[PDB]
């Protein structure tokens, strides 16, 4: 069972960085995150149109799976607030469906392996291999073409700020001028808690963005460094944990935006 942990074929080191700009020879250069965002857009649109193209009673196959996921998410949101479950559903649904596939893309062979570049070779008596990467030529860093979209602080900040503006739009939609009444109302001790609530309301999008970005970053980097430790037979349970945590985090992000909507509107 534990007889074939051969580390002789493995990565030389670990490459850890923030989002990396793709080559992008023409103007407006895309990133490594803004090619996988496009590929996940295409994938989710293909799945939606495959479920859409044949709609009928007693669903079976992928259409049944999509309907089950949608109704499960509907029931999850209806528990929090049944008034807006049919109204704000598209945003939370696409947040969940997008971050789900963004996190599940990170496990794919090639994420951190393919590069655009804008045994004997391994070090002995060491647990980590030292086989140089392909583009060791010209001293290039082997820029990872595929990097998980949610592991970037730009797309994540984007969805966080759209969540912020959605919560504020649809809390201001039907509350009158009650937001100014909710914060610093100068009513006994409630002014202090209103000020702190305003600060918390300001820091919700930053908290969400940092949380999800760091979660995917930590997952992918853990995968990288523990493949660097032992290339095989070590990271199966941790790969399972990382795919599970990516899925559940994609869920919790949508639930957090919906719960913030509920607490803002009530």
């Amino acid at each position: 069972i534990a007889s074939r942990f051969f580390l002789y074929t493995g990565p030389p080191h670990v490459e850890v960085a923030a989002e990396v700009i793709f080559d992008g020879i023409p103007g407006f250069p895309i990133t490594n995150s803004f090619v996988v965002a496009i590929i996940i857009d295409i994938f989710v649109i293909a799945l939606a149109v495959a479920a859409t193209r044949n709609l009928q009673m007693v669903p079976r196959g992928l259409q049944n799976v999509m309907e089950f996921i949608l109704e499960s998410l509907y029931n999850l949101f209806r528990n929090i607030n049944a008034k807006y479950v049919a109204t704000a559903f598209p945003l939370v649904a696409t947040i969940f469906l997008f971050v789900l596939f963004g996190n599940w893309f990170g496990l794919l062979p090639g994420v951190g392996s393919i590069g655009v570049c804008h045994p004997l070779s391994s070090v002995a008596a060491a647990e980590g291999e030292e086989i140089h990467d392909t583009c060791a030529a010209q001293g290039k860093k082997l820029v990872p073409l595929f990097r998980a979209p949610a592991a970037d602080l730009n797309f994540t900040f984007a969805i966080a700020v759209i969540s912020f503006v959605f919560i504020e739009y649809w809390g201001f939609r039907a509350l009158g001028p009650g937001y100014l009444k909710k914060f610093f109302n100068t009513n006994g001790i409630m002014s202090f808690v209103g000020i702190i609530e305003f600060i918390s309301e300001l820091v919700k999008p930053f908290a969400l963005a940092f949380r999800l970005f760091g979660n995917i970053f930590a997952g992918e980097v853990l995968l990288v460094v523990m493949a660097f430790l032992v290339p095989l037979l070590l990271p199966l349970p941790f790969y399972g944990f990382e795919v599970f945590v990516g899925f559940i985090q994609a869920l919790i992000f949508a639930l957090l935006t919906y719960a913030f909507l509920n607490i803002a509107v009530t």
Partner: protein, 155 residues
Amino acid sequence: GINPTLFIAQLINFLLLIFILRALLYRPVMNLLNERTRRIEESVRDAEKVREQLANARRDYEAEIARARQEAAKIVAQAQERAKQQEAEIIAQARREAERLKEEARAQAEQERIRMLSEAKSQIADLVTLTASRVLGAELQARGHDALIAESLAA
């Protein structure tokens, strides 16, 4: 990395995604609402159709009891009509026939009795026999004559 241009590009990409998926999530909402309305209205109309089927059964028993009652009424009506008919028959023919039989019978009685009103049928032979012999005598002896005895015999 911190860059506003890439952030704005991601914002625009997600706006396109939310519009496309707004269409593709507007489709299943009244897919499922249509399914649920079909189910609930179908259960309601199934109960309704059960009730109307029971209404046919209720009208079935109503027609059954009504038809049984008019059948019973008409059979007893015919029974008593012909009953009165045959009582009229039995008493009428009984009385008239009995009266006819007794009146012809007494007429025959008078016809049998008229024939004895004649001299030989008036039984004169046994009269003279008992007067002559059954008086402990031979003939018209002792207290015996001929003329007045025959006159009283004629009576």
